Design a protein around this ligand. Structure first.
Ligand SMILES: *[C@@H]1O[C@H](CO)[C@@H](O[C@@H]2O[C@H](CO)[C@@H](O[C@@H]3O[C@H](CO[C@H]4O[C@H](CO)[C@@H](O)[C@H](O)[C@@H]4O)[C@@H](O)[C@H](O)[C@@H]3O)[C@H](O)[C@H]2NC(C)=O)[C@H](O)[C@H]1NC(C)=O
Ligand SMILES: CC(=O)N[C@@H]1[C@@H](O)[C@H](O[C@@H]2O[C@H](CO[C@]3(C(=O)O)C[C@H](O)[C@@H](NC(C)=O)[C@H]([C@H](O)[C@H](O)CO)O3)[C@H](O)[C@H](O)[C@H]2O)[C@@H](CO)O[C@H]1O
Ligand SMILES: CC(=O)N[C@@H]1[C@@H](O)[C@H](O[C@@H]2O[C@H](CO[C@]3(C(=O)O)C[C@H](O)[C@@H](NC(C)=O)[C@H]([C@H](O)[C@H](O)CO)O3)[C@H](O)[C@H](O)[C@H]2O)[C@@H](CO)O[C@H]1O
Ligand SMILES: CC(=O)N[C@H]1[C@H]([C@H](O)[C@H](O)CO)O[C@@](OC[C@H]2O[C@@H](O)[C@H](O)[C@@H](O)[C@H]2O)(C(=O)O)C[C@@H]1O
Ligand SMILES: *[C@@H]1O[C@H](CO)[C@@H](O[C@@H]2O[C@H](CO)[C@@H](O)[C@H](O)[C@H]2NC(C)=O)[C@H](O)[C@H]1NC(C)=O
Ligand SMILES: *[C@@H]1O[C@H](CO)[C@@H](O)[C@H](O)[C@H]1NC(C)=O
Ligand SMILES: *[C@@H]1O[C@H](CO)[C@@H](O)[C@H](O)[C@H]1NC(C)=O
Ligand SMILES: *[C@@H]1O[C@H](CO)[C@@H](O)[C@H](O)[C@H]1NC(C)=O
Lengths: 170, 318, 319, 169, 318, 170
């Protein structure tokens, strides 16, 4: 577990139908919301991968049990025991596959959330600080164009650093 | 000024199991166990033979119900419930081995034994129990030998079939077990009866036994069937005194095919690789809970109604 | 002025294996492989029958050891080592299929065949090998038919059993293989012996074979047993002239139950769903290393003494 | 692995017994030890979830007579089949435990890290990490202030101006 | 003024599969599926017997090909293709059980039955079909009994083998099925032949099946074999009238060995625990794709050419 | 999954052949590279751990089908069905084994990279800042011996803190 999705982020946003992860900002101009295409595609691609590995090339089996006529009792008992043993193995394997796959899928999605968070944190450098809940309090005036530059991964921290640091200390 | 990170969620989540949690809610999920089948035998792309009410064994001996299926070629052979093997009452030694050989085959050819009998033998015995064209008849690949003069001793007789082919042939014969002394005497005479059969790889003796027993299709006597494989170049000889039901043709099983026992009608416009008594299973899922008895290339049977695979993150509603 | 984060640890930790380390120390771990089990047959909640020294086949033919086990109902049938099937020497054709059918049943009823024999047949043959009250007797569900007048030809005889019931019945008969020509002649006469049996679905013929062989229970004769199922509404007819050990009752196997082969003593105070030769296995654990041969609802057998599943964190004690 | 347990945390505390994870502190008043309930239960609940899957539980009959001879060829087929089934279960049992143990250890490591990270974002600019799992706090923090850190009630902005002066001088 | 962290990469990575990605490039990988075996039977450390062209059944009855394999001790027994079991036409009833018993054994001892025959019997029957050192001979462990005086009735005869040992013995006998009534009368007389065999646990009757007409047809002379186990303390008795091929020795299977069928040359320098038709498999890998048919302590067969296990991190080249 | 390898680290270093993880530095005297022993060993020990589990053997099996002679058709069919079922199980288990193992191996290596990064970041404390691509910009002259002290985990931050803080602030 990576601490984000059912962790320090209080809840999901049902209003974000645009993608799996994303931004909400608040500046003097107003509020707004955008989905991050890169992190969502990284998660979706891994899901796709697990589904591609699910849907195996198979062995040809023939009948060893007559549907319409009786089978000798001893051999039929051997066959019953064998098929039931095989089915117990596959039932167990199927349950385990899905339980294990599911744990990994949930933790992978948590990881992709955290990596986005961490990428934005390093990008903001000393111009911002974290609240506990997954927001960044930005200590300069951040334009709608400035906001877009934080999502766009093009934001230049050195350009706002003087202003931000003054506000952080004062 | 502030920028916030988050993930999506939905109002209606789906529950999945994990290693640590039976009841985990995620944004989306899909089934990994197939529960629905197709109620048809999907035969497109297969040279299939639907036997109808003809039982696989009946193809070798030529029971009237199998007249359309005495020879052929197929990669898929379909047996139906209450198929008919025997018109005259009786049974076959090692019958499920024989049925399974026929059901993995890719066809059957028939070859004359060339057996001829002298003037003391009537080889055209027929019965009300085997009707063919509104007339009393008999298994098409066999001949019921009886004394031409009723009550007279059936003559000592020797018949040999030679396999001059390059593949093994399957040969079947029957032993008549009459239901009374009077019947046995009329057909074969009062002498002691003895039938011996031998090849390079088979030797056996049979004696017709008279015995009271219930009527089946109106008849108390029985014909028991036997079979063996005659290898290329080898010969099989019958020495008999009366009571032999002699092969007039032998079979050759050709190639390989998939045997299916099923209730479902044929759909020659649908394709499939997996079959069961109900029909076909066409799925990309690795597991199924339709039936533990399937043939072909199938998903594995599992004892579960449902197994949901998560395809989304934990769902955390507002 | 500082605050520190930490986890616990313990003085004595336990070793488990992981994907990367066969010697990983952790705060706690628990077993996943049952190794103990109970050396008794936990029969609480089961209507069981302990056959004791009675073999399941003996129930059908009525060997003296099985006189208290000729009928009954059960959900669990217990078979013991060296149980007795045959008082007279012999064997049963297709015996293991028949034993497995009985060991799967949930009971047996007996039904009279109603067979009757003409005056020149003595139907009350007995032997010192099957004793009741310390005297000569015979299988309870069968009759040793011989010529009443010694040395005379046993008459040609027919007997038919009719199944008027709605379930299949199991009929058993024997064939006597005498020890000598003289014995054969005295019991059945000098004629050739032939027994034929036929139903709608079954047909067979048997010939008594005179042969020297070693004595078992003092006897060189044998009675071999045969059996077949008679379907509802079908009849089975015996045609015979000497050598038939004829059934006076047929059996009906009823419902299902679990068959157990074990010599462990029975315990009526504990319950269980899993059994083996040495007793019962009562565990929530998914694996066991007690036995590869079990019956009922059992943990899967594994080739390991112990598999510890970590139930805590890595154990990092103070240096 | 998340880097805390057997990582940057030198070792575990034997003296902690009311939880799996907890706080040690030192201030003017002295030192104190309190376990953390919420992180301790997150871990334990996941363990009991695995244990439940473990004890979730087909009727088999006998196919091998204990007391009488079995036909030799079919007896060999049964032995081969049973031994093959047993190789499969033995392998599956070894894999289950190994894979489960791996995960359990790393999940425990994870809950430690998550508690550490919760406190870090809580303390904000009033403290600095020493790299051994401790937060050097740059203001005076009495026993009620310490409890304020454990109950997730610590308001950083209350000590911020004083803390920053001490961090900068 | 900077310090950078990083990881190695390589020029040529290896492609492996993961749960989420086929074609994941990694810095190094090793194979988990053994695809190469040794085309030799590595027998170092094994007391073995290579039977050559002697079939295991031939060891018990003493076919000339098996003269050097009538007894012995081994922990490994190696059977070859087309090995010889019989020198005279015929076959063994229940043969595959018997062969598996022999191929599971750790050796064989022979014990004389002690059988002797009255003056009316010639026990030295031989045949040009079983040549030994250029002379007409017979199975070394059996005796062909015929009437001393041709055409006269073979006497009623009894022979009893007593197992006075502490372990079960395996006794084999043969039944001669003559080629014609004329041959049957010359060997054994005009009477009805009957062979009865009985122990405490076994009884059976055999009646020779007399063939017919030319020697080249299917029903000619053969000798078929039967076997049973004789428990410690038990006696087995033969009563016979003509047609018995009697045992002059019985066998005793000892201990356990590993049975191998292969035509691969033996190598004594080379140690192994796993074998197939084509040789040995010596690998630490847990899977193999050489053959679904192996014996010994073997890696599990899998239907995969290759399964690569990552031994390095993701390979991310510049 | 841990965000470092094929994450915020742009690429690997083919030039580093003495270890899996390491350090490149930049000061007035020039450039250097060294491998980090402990973290590469931590990673190699876990790999070799897995290889040991892999090659871990076993049950002795005998033959149940004859190579050189025929066997009865019905039991032959049962043996075929059973052997093909067993093989499908092992083939599936073999494929799952390495898919799962490989996923874990890749993420474990990512994790060891991250923990090295985190170790260094904590050491430097307030004397350095992250550039977001795996480098620490240090705010004091750091000569070859000072670089060694960082890689050797004996860098004393308080020795440079004064200078570092006023360079970060100006
Ligand atoms: C199984 O065994 C059963 C007992 O033998 C067989 O049932 C019998 O088959 C015969 C011949 O078909 C029937 O015989 C005839 O009976 C009628 C008169 O029937 C009426 O009167 C009788 C006597 O009171 C009464 O029991 C009946 O229910 C009728 O009301 C005569 O006119 C004929 O000449 C001839 O004697 C038997 O009736 C019949 N029994 C029954 C109950 O059906 C049965 O055939 C055997 N099954 C097999 C598979 O062979
Ligand atoms: C037929 C008869 O009485 N013959 C005399 C033999 O009994 C006698 O030999 C002894 O036979 C003993 C076995 O006797 C019984 C038995 O208990 O098994 C006596 C039964 O009444 C008889 N029952 C029937 C239905 O025949 C039974 C049966 O005939 C046989 O089992 C068939 O084998 O035999 C016992 O084996 C003694 O060891 C044996 O000496 C001989 C010698 O006295 O003389 C006969 O006239
Ligand atoms: C009894 C006899 O000698 N009769 C003469 C026949 O041998 C002969 O036919 C030829 O028989 C040949 C086989 O002869 C042996 C054998 O198999 O080698 C000779 C053995 O001594 C004899 N041994 C015994 C125990 O009897 C043996 C045996 O009887 C048979 O194998 C049983 O079938 O036969 C061979 O098959 C030739 O192809 C065949 O012509 C006929 C014709 O010459 O005359 C008989 O007097
Ligand atoms: C070859 C031959 O004999 N065909 C006969 C046939 C056989 O003799 C018979 O099947 C041997 O049992 O019998 C046919 O008659 C059967 C007929 O016999 C009557 O006597 C009886 O009363 C009827 O119930 C009925 O069984 C037959 O068709 O089977 C005639 C055939 O020509
Ligand atoms: C096998 O036959 C021998 C003799 O044919 C039987 O042994 C005799 O047994 C009795 C009592 O057990 C002894 O008094 C004799 O001394 C034994 N004879 C010898 C010479 O040892 C033996 O009982 C038979 N086995 C079976 C099972 O019938
Ligand atoms: C085997 O089990 C199936 C499932 O109930 C049942 O149809 C069948 O009768 C059993 N067969 C035998 C060998 O008795
Ligand atoms: C749910 O998953 C299936 C397959 O992964 C996919 O077809 C579907 O689009 C998903 N539904 C949603 C809500 O995205
Ligand atoms: C079969 O009969 C033919 C013709 O008599 C003969 O050529 C051939 O040898 C016989 N086959 C065998 C194997 O005896």
């Amino acid at each position: 577990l990576f601490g984000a999705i059912a962790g320090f982020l209080e809840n999901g946003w049902e209003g974000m139908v645009d993608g799996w992860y994303g931004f909400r900002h608040q500046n003097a101009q107003g509020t707004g919301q955008a989905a991050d295409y890169k992190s969502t595609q990284a998660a979706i691609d891994q899901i796709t991968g697990k589904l591609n590995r699910l849907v195996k090339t198979n062995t040809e089996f023939e009948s060893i049990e007559s549907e319409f006529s009786e089978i000798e009792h001893q051999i039929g008992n051997v066959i019953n025991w064998t098929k039931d043993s095989i089915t117990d193995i596959w039932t167990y394997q199927a349950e385990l596959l899905v339980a294990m796959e599911n744990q990994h899928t949930i933790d992978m999605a948590d990881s992709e959330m955290l990596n986005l968070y961490e990428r934005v944190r390093k990008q903001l450098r000393q111009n911002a600080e974290e609240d506990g809940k997954g927001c960044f309090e930005i200590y300069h005036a951040c334009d709608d164009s400035c906001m877009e530059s934080i999502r766009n991964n093009t934001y230049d921290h050195s350009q706002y650093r003087e202003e931000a640091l003054l506000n952080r200390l004062n | 000024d502030k920028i916030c990170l988050g993930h999506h969620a939905v109002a209606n989540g789906t529950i999945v199991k994990t290693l640590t949690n039976e009841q985990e809610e995620v944004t989306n999920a899909t089934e990994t166990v197939e529960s629905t089948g197709i109620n048809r035998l999907c035969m497109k792309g297969r040279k299939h033979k639907d036997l109808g009410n003809c039982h696989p064994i009946g193809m070798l001996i030529g029971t009237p119900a199998c007249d359309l299926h005495l020879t052929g070629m197929w990669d898929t052979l379909i047996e139906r419930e209450n198929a008919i093997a025997y018109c005259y009452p009786g049974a076959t030694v090692n019958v499920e081995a024989l049925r399974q050989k026929i059901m993995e085959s890719g066809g059957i050819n028939k070859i004359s034994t060339g057996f001829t009998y002298g003037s003391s033998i009537n080889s055209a015995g027929t019965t009300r129990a085997c009707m063919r064209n509104g007339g009393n008849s008999f298994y098409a690949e066999l001949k019921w030998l009886v004394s031409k003069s009723a009550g007279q001793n059936f003559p000592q007789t020797t018949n040999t079939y030679r396999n001059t082919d390059t593949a093994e042939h399957l040969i079947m014969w029957g032993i008549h077990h009459p239901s009374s002394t009077q019947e046995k005497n009329d057909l074969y005479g009062t002498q002691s009866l003895s039938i011996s059969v031998g090849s390079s790889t088979y030797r056996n003796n049979f004696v017709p036994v008279v015995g009271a027993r219930p009527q089946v299709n109106g008849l108390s006597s029985r014909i028991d069937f036997h079979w063996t494989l005659v290898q290329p170049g080898d010969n099989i000889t019958f020495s008999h005194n009366g009571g032999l039901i002699a092969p007039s043709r032998v079979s050759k099983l050709i190639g390989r095919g998939l045997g299916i026992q099923s209730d479902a009608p044929i759909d020659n416009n649908c394709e499939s690789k997996c079959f069961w008594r109900g029909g076909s299973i066409n799925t990309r899922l690795p597991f199924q809970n339709l039936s533990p008895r399937t043939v072909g290339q199938c998903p594995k049977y599992v004892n579960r109604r449902s197994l949901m695979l998560a395809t989304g993150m934990r769902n955390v509603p507002e």
